[PDB]
Structure 1
Amino acid sequence: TNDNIKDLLDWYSSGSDTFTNSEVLDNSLGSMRIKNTDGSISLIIFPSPYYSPAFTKGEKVDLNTKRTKKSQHTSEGTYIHFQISGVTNTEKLPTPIELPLKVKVHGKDSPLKYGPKFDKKQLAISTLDFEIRHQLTQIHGLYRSSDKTGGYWKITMNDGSTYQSDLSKKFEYNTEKPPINIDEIKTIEAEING
């Protein structure tokens, strides 16, 4: 594969951070300072004009986010994470739901018809992106060979509205739309090509 595809493989196989019921310390309207219940602090940026959380100091939030650079300890010993997007409310569903991924690879529908499970009412579109693409890389070989370097995912809501991303490029954080209610997702489909 070429270097940009290796960069995509690195990003989508580098894990993510999940924190629940973190506390907002400061919201600078495009960036947030948040205290996680393990004592770490997350500094999270929101580059999109369409998704800029407004939660104020003291409110609780959930994080399902990616790091942009290595976490560092301060002189006082506080651990600081540097993240992007992935901040939602703390509302939970009574039991988890699965978001099965319907996947086509080189025009052939895969028999693997499962997906990640979540008990949160709302997820950021970027979170859905990394969960989807992580499954595509791990299970379907996305970015692991020259024949699996592009395609798309598409979410269709119960009301017919859609969200989509091009697998040949990094997720479009700069135009990310606001988080969605996952219980109202109708289907998630993806196709891998090359």
Structure 2
Amino acid sequence: STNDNIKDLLDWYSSGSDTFTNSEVLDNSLGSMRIKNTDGSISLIIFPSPYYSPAFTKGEKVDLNTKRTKKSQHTSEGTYIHFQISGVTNTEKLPTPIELPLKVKVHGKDSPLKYWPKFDKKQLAISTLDFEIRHQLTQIHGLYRSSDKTGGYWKITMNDGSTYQSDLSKKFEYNTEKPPINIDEIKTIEAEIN
């Protein structure tokens, strides 16, 4: 084949991401939020899911752990504008950063993690969990880097047994994304590459 899902999945997930804390809501109106960041940067953020639809009103403070949907641009006024998709949460913090319990398998064998980050927010968006999990997978464990590893899944299970799963052979379904979760309530995260 040519027209490959992959190299597209790899460039999205191997890429960095934007993290802002204590951003302020300038607006929330037509399925999108307008947001002021604390580095003199602005963000227009879309939310295509009927199940995840931020209710934050102008003036409220938000946290951003988000990905860019296209190139950011400068303006004048003279400020950087970003175009992002989801990953807007409340600013509620954990007293201590925690490591989220991720276990990876590659070739049916436990794959030791590396640079798996700690989190200090109570809430993360499921899309955020997703690009963090997949970044760990793309950068340390070879996901999308050899035909060997192009599928598999991740599965998060809460304390109360409800689950979130995403297939790594596909892009994250932003259009049907569920609301953020209390990450301190995550029981395990399992990823398997096949």
Runs of 4+ more than 6 Å apart? none
Distance 1:103 1:113, change over 3 A: farther
In 2, Cα distance between equivalents of 1:36 and 1:6: 31
Aligned 8 A contact 2:114 2:140 in 1: no
In 1, Cα distance between equivalents of 2:152 and 2:114: 18
| Residue 71 of structure 1: aligned partner | 72
**2:152 match: secondary structure:** strand
In 2, Cα distance between equivalents of 1:46 and 1:101: 27
In 2, Cα distance between equivalents of 1:125 and 1:79: 26
In 2, Cα distance between equivalents of 1:113 and 1:72: 33
- After superposition, what is the alpha-carbon deviation per residue over 1:51-104, rounded to whole angstroms, capped at 9, x for unaligned? 010100000000000000110012331210000000000000100000131111
* Alpha-carbon RMSD: 1.4
**1:137 match: secondary structure:** helix
In 2, Cα distance between equivalents of 1:153 and 1:97: 19
**Normalised by the size of structure 1, how large is the TM-score?**
0.96
Where in structure 1 are there 5+ consecutive unaligned residues? none
Q: How far off its partner does 1:110 sit?
A: 2.0
**1:5 match: secondary structure:** coil
Percent identity for Structure 1 against Structure 2: 99
Q: How far off its partner does 1:114 sit?
A: 7.6
Aligned 8 A contact 2:22 2:38 in 1: yes
Q: How far off its partner does 1:155 sit?
A: 0.2
Q: Which moved more, 1:4-13 or 1:101-110?
A: 101-110
In 2, Cα distance between equivalents of 1:113 and 1:73: 35
Distance 1:106 1:2, change over 3 A: farther
Distance 1:111 1:13, change over 3 A: closer
In 1, Cα distance between equivalents of 2:98 and 2:31: 30
Q: How far off its partner does 1:39 sit?
A: 1.2
In 1, Cα distance between equivalents of 2:25 and 2:4: 38
**1:160 match: secondary structure:** coil
Distance 1:119 1:150, change over 3 A: same
Q: How far off its partner does 1:113 sit?
A: 8.1
| 2:145 corresponds to 1:144 | yes
In 2, Cα distance between equivalents of 1:59 and 1:110: 41
Q: How far off its partner does 1:2 sit?
A: 6.6
| Residue 181 of structure 1: aligned partner | 182
In 2, Cα distance between equivalents of 1:179 and 1:5: 27
| Number of residue-to-residue matches in the alignment | 193
Distance 1:113 1:73, change over 3 A: closer
In 1, Cα distance between equivalents of 2:86 and 2:98: 22
Q: How far off its partner does 1:106 sit?
A: 1.9
Q: How far off its partner does 1:162 sit?
A: 0.3
Aligned 8 A contact 2:101 2:187 in 1: no
- After superposition, what is the alpha-carbon deviation per residue over 1:23-55, rounded to whole angstroms, capped at 9, x for unaligned? 000001410000001111100000000001010
**2:10 match: secondary structure:** helix
In 2, Cα distance between equivalents of 1:63 and 1:159: 26
| Residue 19 of structure 1: aligned partner | 20
